Tab-separated table of C-alpha atoms in Angstrom:
chain	number	residue	atom	x	y	z
A	10	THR	CA	-13.873	25.094	8.985
A	11	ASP	CA	-14.361	23.657	12.474
A	12	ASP	CA	-15.852	20.574	10.803
A	13	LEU	CA	-13.637	17.527	11.306
A	14	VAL	CA	-15.770	15.236	9.190
A	15	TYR	CA	-15.284	17.669	6.321
A	16	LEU	CA	-11.528	17.645	6.845
A	17	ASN	CA	-11.030	13.895	6.965
A	18	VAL	CA	-13.187	13.648	3.887
A	19	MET	CA	-10.714	16.004	2.230
A	20	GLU	CA	-7.647	14.258	3.632
A	21	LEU	CA	-9.042	11.049	2.195
A	22	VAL	CA	-9.689	12.481	-1.263
A	23	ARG	CA	-6.130	13.779	-1.172
A	24	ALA	CA	-4.908	10.290	-0.319
A	25	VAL	CA	-6.868	8.976	-3.316
A	26	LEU	CA	-5.281	11.451	-5.706
A	27	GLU	CA	-1.782	10.728	-4.514
A	28	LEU	CA	-2.359	7.030	-5.106
A	29	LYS	CA	-3.502	7.941	-8.622
A	30	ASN	CA	-0.235	9.442	-9.851
A	31	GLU	CA	2.062	7.284	-7.747
A	32	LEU	CA	1.418	3.779	-9.008
A	33	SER	CA	3.271	5.274	-11.965
A	34	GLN	CA	6.250	5.856	-9.711
A	35	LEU	CA	5.947	2.734	-7.552
A	36	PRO	CA	6.895	-0.953	-7.745
A	37	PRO	CA	4.259	-3.665	-7.058
A	38	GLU	CA	5.553	-4.222	-3.485
A	39	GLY	CA	4.881	-0.595	-2.590
A	40	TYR	CA	1.185	-0.633	-3.529
A	41	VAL	CA	0.583	-2.073	-0.070
A	42	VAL	CA	1.816	1.074	1.702
A	43	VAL	CA	-0.256	3.502	-0.357
A	44	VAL	CA	-3.493	1.607	0.226
A	45	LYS	CA	-2.490	1.270	3.857
A	46	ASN	CA	-2.549	5.109	3.800
A	47	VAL	CA	-5.919	5.406	2.141
A	48	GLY	CA	-7.122	2.892	4.675
A	49	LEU	CA	-5.769	4.873	7.603
A	50	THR	CA	-7.065	8.290	6.636
A	51	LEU	CA	-10.352	6.487	6.077
A	52	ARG	CA	-10.334	5.102	9.595
A	53	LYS	CA	-9.921	8.669	10.828
A	54	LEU	CA	-12.941	9.755	8.777
A	55	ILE	CA	-15.142	6.840	9.779
A	56	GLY	CA	-14.044	7.493	13.352
A	57	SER	CA	-14.909	11.168	13.555
A	58	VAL	CA	-18.246	10.363	11.978
A	59	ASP	CA	-18.885	7.568	14.496
A	60	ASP	CA	-18.485	10.363	17.078
A	61	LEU	CA	-21.358	12.483	15.719
A	62	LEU	CA	-23.918	9.715	15.408
A	63	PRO	CA	-25.247	9.926	19.012
A	64	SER	CA	-26.460	13.500	18.561
A	65	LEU	CA	-28.936	13.182	15.666
A	66	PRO	CA	-32.166	11.559	14.307
A	67	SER	CA	-32.055	7.783	14.002
A	68	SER	CA	-33.726	8.297	10.611
A	69	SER	CA	-30.339	9.652	9.487
A	70	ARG	CA	-28.155	7.195	11.372
A	71	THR	CA	-29.596	4.343	9.334
A	72	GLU	CA	-28.621	5.805	5.940
A	73	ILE	CA	-25.382	7.218	7.369
A	74	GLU	CA	-24.158	3.862	8.648
A	75	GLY	CA	-25.262	2.811	5.195
A	76	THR	CA	-22.624	4.850	3.432
A	77	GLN	CA	-20.103	3.941	6.134
A	78	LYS	CA	-20.574	0.225	5.548
A	79	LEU	CA	-20.464	1.236	1.898
A	80	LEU	CA	-16.973	2.700	2.362
A	81	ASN	CA	-15.595	-0.297	4.192
A	82	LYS	CA	-16.856	-2.306	1.249
A	83	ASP	CA	-15.245	0.214	-1.114
A	84	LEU	CA	-11.905	-0.214	0.652
A	85	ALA	CA	-12.144	-4.000	0.486
A	86	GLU	CA	-12.697	-3.812	-3.252
A	87	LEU	CA	-9.661	-1.487	-3.516
A	88	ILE	CA	-7.538	-3.870	-1.480
A	89	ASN	CA	-8.558	-6.809	-3.658
A	90	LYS	CA	-7.733	-4.874	-6.841
A	91	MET	CA	-4.368	-4.099	-5.309
A	92	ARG	CA	-3.655	-7.738	-4.529
A	93	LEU	CA	-4.531	-8.524	-8.160
A	94	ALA	CA	-2.206	-5.807	-9.442
A	95	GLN	CA	0.674	-7.255	-7.447
A	96	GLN	CA	0.174	-10.844	-8.622
A	97	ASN	CA	-0.410	-9.630	-12.137
A	98	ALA	CA	2.636	-7.401	-12.467
A	99	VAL	CA	4.815	-8.881	-15.197
A	100	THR	CA	1.774	-10.321	-17.029
A	101	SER	CA	-0.410	-8.897	-19.799
A	102	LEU	CA	-3.121	-8.210	-17.204
A	103	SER	CA	-0.749	-5.836	-15.401
A	104	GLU	CA	-2.255	-2.606	-16.759
A	105	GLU	CA	-5.914	-3.607	-16.576
A	106	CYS	CA	-5.444	-4.720	-12.968
A	107	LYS	CA	-3.953	-1.304	-12.156
A	108	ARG	CA	-6.702	0.459	-14.077
A	109	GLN	CA	-9.166	-1.424	-11.869
A	110	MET	CA	-7.275	-0.392	-8.755
A	111	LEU	CA	-7.689	3.279	-9.669
A	112	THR	CA	-11.392	2.925	-10.294
A	113	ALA	CA	-11.794	1.138	-6.980
A	114	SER	CA	-10.155	4.040	-5.217
A	115	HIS	CA	-11.983	6.591	-7.326
A	116	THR	CA	-15.441	5.397	-6.287
A	117	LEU	CA	-14.021	5.096	-2.806
A	118	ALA	CA	-13.518	8.856	-2.841
A	119	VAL	CA	-16.865	9.507	-4.451
A	120	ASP	CA	-18.619	7.573	-1.675
A	121	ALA	CA	-16.588	9.487	0.869
A	122	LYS	CA	-18.156	12.616	-0.638
A	123	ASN	CA	-21.641	11.130	-0.433
A	124	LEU	CA	-20.906	10.302	3.186
A	125	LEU	CA	-20.309	14.010	3.747
A	126	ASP	CA	-23.558	15.118	2.093
A	127	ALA	CA	-25.482	12.564	4.121
A	128	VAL	CA	-23.897	14.087	7.213
A	129	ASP	CA	-24.354	17.719	6.292
A	130	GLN	CA	-27.955	17.040	5.334
A	131	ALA	CA	-28.668	15.065	8.491
A	132	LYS	CA	-26.969	17.777	10.602
A	133	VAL	CA	-29.569	20.193	9.263
A	134	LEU	CA	-32.770	18.173	9.686
A	135	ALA	CA	-31.483	17.782	13.215
A	136	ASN	CA	-31.029	21.496	13.881
A	137	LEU	CA	-34.547	22.429	12.703
A	138	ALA	CA	-36.376	19.731	14.665
A	139	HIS	CA	-34.646	21.414	17.613
B	5	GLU	CA	-11.269	23.605	-1.801
B	6	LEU	CA	-13.038	20.237	-1.733
B	7	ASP	CA	-14.868	21.015	-4.965
B	8	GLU	CA	-11.448	21.718	-6.476
B	9	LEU	CA	-9.865	18.399	-5.419
B	10	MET	CA	-13.178	16.776	-6.250
B	11	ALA	CA	-12.893	17.573	-9.974
B	12	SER	CA	-9.129	16.938	-10.043
B	13	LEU	CA	-10.224	13.296	-9.685
B	14	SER	CA	-11.372	13.334	-13.322
C	1	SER	CA	-18.812	-0.272	15.414
C	2	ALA	CA	-17.801	0.765	11.865
C	3	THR	CA	-14.089	1.052	12.712
C	4	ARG	CA	-14.157	-2.596	13.904
C	5	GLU	CA	-15.001	-4.263	10.570
C	6	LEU	CA	-12.441	-1.828	9.105
C	7	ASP	CA	-9.553	-2.633	11.449
C	8	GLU	CA	-10.322	-6.233	10.546
C	9	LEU	CA	-10.248	-5.253	6.892
C	10	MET	CA	-6.930	-3.555	7.740
C	11	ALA	CA	-5.213	-6.536	9.336
C	12	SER	CA	-5.418	-8.553	6.102
C	13	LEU	CA	-2.867	-6.009	4.743
């Protein structure tokens, strides 16, 4: 609704699904742009979360920055799989490398979701202390 | 609408 | 903070 964190989390899952059915339609050189996208919508998410942090229990902020760091890591793994899919286009490891790329992005989305729950849940434990 | 996209993943 | 290690992650692209 008026929840930005929710929205960017949805923008980012959208970006992950596009990527899914558009390696099929893209050449190796283009895989850079798509991930660049997923990266950018992610920065927007991680940014609008970074904005909330101040107003809530530190006990949350630990585990929240946990899933944030987790996402950065998730991106990195996606980027690496993408690099591997470029280099390995035109070799027998082409498909597997792409398969890996999808999985990297998949769990990227999943962890984006878990970021949201951690936020929703921390938003609550905040409201009731107050 | 998130739950929708969420399952579309699989 | 978080954005920072990300923008760095981003540059490598």
